[PDB]
Amino acid sequence: AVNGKGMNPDYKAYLMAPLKKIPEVTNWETFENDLRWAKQNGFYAITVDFWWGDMEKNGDQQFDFSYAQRFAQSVKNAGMKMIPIISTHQCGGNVGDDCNVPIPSWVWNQKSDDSLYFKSETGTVNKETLNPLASDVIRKEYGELYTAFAAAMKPYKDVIAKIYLSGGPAGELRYPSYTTSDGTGYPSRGKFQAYTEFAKSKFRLWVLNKYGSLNEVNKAWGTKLISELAILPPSDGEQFLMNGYLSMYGKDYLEWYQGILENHTKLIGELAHNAFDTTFQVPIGAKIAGVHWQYNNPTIPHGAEKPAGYNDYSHLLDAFKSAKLDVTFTCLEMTDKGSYPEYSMPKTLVQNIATLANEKGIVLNGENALSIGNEEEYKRVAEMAFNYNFAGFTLLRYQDVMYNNSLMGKFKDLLGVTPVMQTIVVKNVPTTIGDTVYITGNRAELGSWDTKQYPIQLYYDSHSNDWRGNVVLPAERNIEFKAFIKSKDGTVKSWQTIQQSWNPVPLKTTSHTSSW
Ligand SMILES: OC[C@H]1O[C@H](O[C@H]2[C@H](O)[C@@H](O)[C@@H](O)O[C@@H]2CO)[C@H](O)[C@@H](O)[C@@H]1O
Ligand SMILES: OC[C@H]1O[C@H](O[C@H]2[C@H](O)[C@@H](O)[C@H](O)O[C@@H]2CO)[C@H](O)[C@@H](O)[C@@H]1O
Ligand SMILES: OC[C@H]1O[C@H](O[C@H]2[C@H](O)[C@@H](O)[C@H](O)O[C@@H]2CO)[C@H](O)[C@@H](O)[C@@H]1O
Ligand SMILES: OC[C@H]1O[C@H](O[C@H]2[C@H](O)[C@@H](O)[C@H](O)O[C@@H]2CO)[C@H](O)[C@@H](O)[C@@H]1O
Ligand SMILES: [Ca+2]
């Protein structure tokens, strides 16, 4: 892996449940046998959406957790763990959805203004999730929903391994900038979502707070604004993404726009730790979307990320580290393209988010964006997950492997791995001053025969005069590897004589000793 180290010793594989309730798919008895089958293939737990439109449908404070308790009891019976997602967003309208659960109808009647929904550059209204700017309705409703849930699922705490929060559309912290009705679906540019009367007022008040008066606004932006009513979001998003973003106005508008998602992250992470920390004592996390199209478009750079709310990823992850939330990036199986008309760059994007997260000390988990129907994509998820320190990988979705034993078998071999620490020892190495010994091998957890970015560093033992190191390996998988010398200046001076193997790696800690 990256920086001379190996795979994360805490790695676990997870399975996403159907979007529909288990009784609308099969019966609870073959569901319990499918979870026993899943666990024999390396899965640790199942993640499942518990929808808001189902848990508090009839009215405020009129709760129904009967489906969540019945699902938890069958997980108990099958001997597995679950990871609930408190889904405060709509099921239906996004990629892969085959369900239709709106959020409770009555939440929209709590206000007379337009503070609760979104409106785009061209007037399209969106009501998939609550507008994070209405933080008073969010503190009240999410607060009540998280505490009623902890009291009802308190019996099943031993079956709960983690808890996920929904930060916006499709369960991700972002704005609804890519949707069919707005004309902004893939691979098109996104539209900004700050055109409600309430969002315009809120942008206007933050600017006047930052500067003081219209006078100081014109001096900082270098503008000639006439009245305070002229402080608006962009009237043209395309022109704004072509070059308005470089001005001082541009930088202040994107700081306020992304700033609203950073403050929502701190509010929901605070409501979640209060409600759950005593009762469950599990990690809590949230998800960030992989908006990889229009990334390197020359005319409109980062043309789809910026309307979705992503302008500076380092400042976005900082909100996650201070709210005490783990992060999940949802796009590992794709490769880079970068050509017209999509200008897509998913792997560069995943490498950049992973580097930032590992720098800041944030636990990182991954997911595939679309159904995998081929072993080649499992090898690409494996390369990213084991070389960029991911602590978990969740597979979208249930039916893809549960009804395909050949794909399920390929997943077990490549990704349903249990990490175990082992000691590798290499004797008789002709090392000279400044040289360093590394090991690389055939599987992704050994760097896939790569000698520049991914080899695992070993350490000289001056007492027995050999090179060694405790390495995390995939238990009971066959591996091939070779040690090599790297000079003081990063060049491969020489390789080990014979290729070595461990057929397979034992699952109890031992040592593999070899000679140059
Ligand atoms: O929230 C929905 C989802 O959108 C993106 O998925 C893309 C996919 O990557 C493209 O190949 C294409 O099929 O359009 C999809 C939907 O717009 C993101 O990759 C994903 O993370 C995001 O959550
Ligand atoms: O079950 C979890 C969520 O699954 C879907 O959203 C996925 C989407 O399918 C995928 O392309 C993207 O990369 O990630 C999201 C979030 O995991 C549903 O659309 C969501 O409603 C579900 O919560
Ligand atoms: O609030 C001031 C004005 O902001 C926007 O105009 C921006 C424009 O979006 C940007 O691309 C350009 O380069 O700079 C101007 C700021 O002078 C709104 O479009 C205007 O209606 C606002 O008055
Ligand atoms: O690059 C893929 C191959 O890496 C190793 O091969 C080394 C070989 O061990 C060494 O003696 C020779 O001098 O260089 C090659 C690398 O170019 C593995 O031993 C092979 O199995 C891999 O295919
Ligand atoms: Ca309520």
mmCIF file of C-alpha atoms in Angstrom, residues 15 18 22 25-41 43 46 74 78 80 398-399 401-405 408:
data_model
loop_
_atom_site.group_PDB
_atom_site.id
_atom_site.type_symbol
_atom_site.label_atom_id
_atom_site.label_comp_id
_atom_site.label_asym_id
_atom_site.label_seq_id
_atom_site.Cartn_x
_atom_site.Cartn_y
_atom_site.Cartn_z
ATOM 1 C CA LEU A 15 -23.750 -6.153 2.101
ATOM 2 C CA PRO A 18 -32.914 -4.477 -0.817
ATOM 3 C CA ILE A 22 -37.899 -8.052 3.022
ATOM 4 C CA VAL A 25 -38.967 -9.673 -1.866
ATOM 5 C CA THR A 26 -38.986 -13.116 -0.184
ATOM 6 C CA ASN A 27 -40.013 -14.499 3.286
ATOM 7 C CA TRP A 28 -38.123 -14.240 6.551
ATOM 8 C CA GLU A 29 -37.000 -17.860 6.542
ATOM 9 C CA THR A 30 -35.109 -17.858 3.226
ATOM 10 C CA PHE A 31 -33.886 -14.309 4.299
ATOM 11 C CA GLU A 32 -32.230 -15.872 7.442
ATOM 12 C CA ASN A 33 -30.644 -18.665 5.347
ATOM 13 C CA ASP A 34 -29.315 -16.019 2.810
ATOM 14 C CA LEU A 35 -27.592 -14.176 5.729
ATOM 15 C CA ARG A 36 -25.948 -17.451 6.879
ATOM 16 C CA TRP A 37 -24.823 -17.933 3.252
ATOM 17 C CA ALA A 38 -23.552 -14.334 3.179
ATOM 18 C CA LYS A 39 -21.512 -14.807 6.301
ATOM 19 C CA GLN A 40 -19.823 -17.969 4.960
ATOM 20 C CA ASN A 41 -18.580 -15.776 2.042
ATOM 21 C CA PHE A 43 -19.658 -10.569 4.927
ATOM 22 C CA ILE A 46 -25.913 -6.024 6.391
ATOM 23 C CA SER A 74 -34.105 -12.209 11.970
ATOM 24 C CA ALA A 78 -29.025 -15.745 11.527
ATOM 25 C CA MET A 80 -25.118 -11.494 11.868
ATOM 26 C CA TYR A 398 -28.134 -8.015 -2.188
ATOM 27 C CA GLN A 399 -29.598 -9.804 -5.249
ATOM 28 C CA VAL A 401 -24.510 -12.011 -5.468
ATOM 29 C CA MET A 402 -27.271 -13.830 -3.575
ATOM 30 C CA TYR A 403 -28.708 -15.138 -6.893
ATOM 31 C CA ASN A 404 -25.413 -15.651 -8.713
ATOM 32 C CA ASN A 405 -23.100 -18.212 -7.196
ATOM 33 C CA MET A 408 -20.543 -14.570 -5.133
#
